[PDB]
Design an enzyme around this catalytic site. Sequence first.
Site, PDB file in Angstrom:
ATOM      1  N   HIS A   1       0.869  -1.162   0.000  1.00 21.87           N
ATOM      2  CA  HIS A   1       0.000   0.000   0.000  1.00 21.87           C
ATOM      3  C   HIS A   1       0.907   1.214   0.000  1.00 21.87           C
ATOM      4  CE1 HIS A   1       0.330  -0.578   4.469  1.00 21.87           C
ATOM      5  NE2 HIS A   1       0.189   0.729   4.543  1.00 21.87           N
TER       6      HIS A   1
ATOM      7  N   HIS B   1       1.561   3.866   2.131  1.00 24.34           N
ATOM      8  CA  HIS B   1       2.242   4.467   3.273  1.00 24.34           C
ATOM      9  C   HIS B   1       3.765   4.259   3.203  1.00 24.34           C
ATOM     10  CE1 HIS B   1      -1.725   4.060   5.774  1.00 24.34           C
ATOM     11  NE2 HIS B   1      -1.706   5.174   5.064  1.00 24.34           N
TER      12      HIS B   1
ATOM     13  N   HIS C   1      -6.935  -1.780   6.225  1.00 20.84           N
ATOM     14  CA  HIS C   1      -6.002  -0.757   6.677  1.00 20.84           C
ATOM     15  C   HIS C   1      -6.057   0.473   5.758  1.00 20.84           C
ATOM     16  CE1 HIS C   1      -2.273   0.878   8.313  1.00 20.84           C
ATOM     17  NE2 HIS C   1      -1.835   0.981   7.071  1.00 20.84           N
TER      18      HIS C   1
HETATM   19  C1  LIG Z   1       1.779  -3.858  19.536  1.00 21.72           C
HETATM   20  C2  LIG Z   1       2.184  -2.677  18.623  1.00 21.72           C
HETATM   21  C3  LIG Z   1       2.395  -3.072  17.146  1.00 21.72           C
HETATM   22  C4  LIG Z   1       2.869  -1.907  16.275  1.00 21.72           C
HETATM   23  C5  LIG Z   1       1.847  -0.772  15.978  1.00 21.72           C
HETATM   24  C6  LIG Z   1       2.001  -0.119  14.579  1.00 21.72           C
HETATM   25  C7  LIG Z   1       1.500   1.318  14.272  1.00 21.72           C
HETATM   26  C8  LIG Z   1       2.078   1.592  12.882  1.00 21.72           C
HETATM   27  S1  LIG Z   1       3.503   2.450  12.514  1.00 21.72           S
HETATM   28  C9  LIG Z   1       3.460   2.198  10.829  1.00 21.72           C
HETATM   29  N1  LIG Z   1       4.399   2.678   9.859  1.00 21.72           N
HETATM   30  N2  LIG Z   1       2.390   1.475  10.543  1.00 21.72           N
HETATM   31  C10 LIG Z   1       1.604   1.123  11.622  1.00 21.72           C
HETATM   32  C11 LIG Z   1       0.326   0.280  11.415  1.00 21.72           C
HETATM   33  O1  LIG Z   1      -0.509   0.060  12.342  1.00 21.72           O
HETATM   34  O2  LIG Z   1       0.106  -0.201  10.269  1.00 21.72           O
HETATM   35 ZN   LIG Z   2      -0.159   1.647   6.369  1.00 22.94          ZN
HETATM   36 ZN   LIG Z   3       1.918  -0.025   8.799  1.00 20.33          ZN
END
Ligand SMILES: CCCCCCCc1sc(N)nc1C(=O)O
Ligand SMILES: [Zn+2]
Ligand SMILES: [Zn+2]
Length: 231
Positions: A83, A85, A148
């Site tokens: 995707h 991001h 997402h």
């Molecule tokens: C237990 C915590 C697990 C990590 C949370 C991720 C938060 C982030 S940072 C980023 N570049 N993408 C995301 C996403 O959710 O897709």
């Molecule tokens: Zn993303």
């Molecule tokens: Zn991500």
Amino acid sequence: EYPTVSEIPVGEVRLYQIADGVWSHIATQSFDGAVYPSNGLIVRDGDELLLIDTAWGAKNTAALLAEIEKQIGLPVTRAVSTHFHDDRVGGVDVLRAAGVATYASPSTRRLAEVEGNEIPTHSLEGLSSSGDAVRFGPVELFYPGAAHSTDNLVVYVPSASVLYGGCAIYELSRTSAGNVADADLAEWPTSIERIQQHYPEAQFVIPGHGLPGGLDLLKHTTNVVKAHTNR
Ligand SMILES: CCCCCCCc1sc(N)nc1C(=O)O
Ligand SMILES: [Zn+2]
Ligand SMILES: [Zn+2]
């Protein structure tokens, strides 16, 4: 043995063997004051390697290509971003400069552009609608619908029954959806089901962040998503 966020300093990349000719790559990056781990995939493609997703930035993606070369020693010739991001296209210019042909769906490239992110060179045809599948060397790309993000692909390695979920699939450790800005929480459960529907034979299931698992990760995400539309 699966590496965790606290074990990977920002700028380093770990490779982790999932099956014969299938690795994941794990990096770390700051987002909004905290550092998070991030997975992509590496799939042997005959005498070459296909890359699923950047290592989340230019420095990370450089360290990715150096680890690949030290531990595997075959050339990365193509990559797919799943995707738009930064944990998926951030690093595409380093890949391009190294000689990698970079690919994403037409939706993904449009959205990366609108957002100011790096844009993969080549468009992937055949993925415009919820349910589409295309073969891409040793993997199948599949658009399950919006989750997402409206563009998120997942990737399946048939030889090894590996399903890469990208950021549409969460790890069991994770209980809040966190940043769902670009998400569609109404369609997300239904899109997770199209996956369960298309890949019931999946032995290994890799979310975009955190620990690999099995198909239970599908249902686990559905629940964590529903928890956030209720409140
Ligand atoms: C237990 C915590 C697990 C990590 C949370 C991720 C938060 C982030 S940072 C980023 N570049 N993408 C995301 C996403 O959710 O897709
Ligand atoms: Zn993303
Ligand atoms: Zn991500």
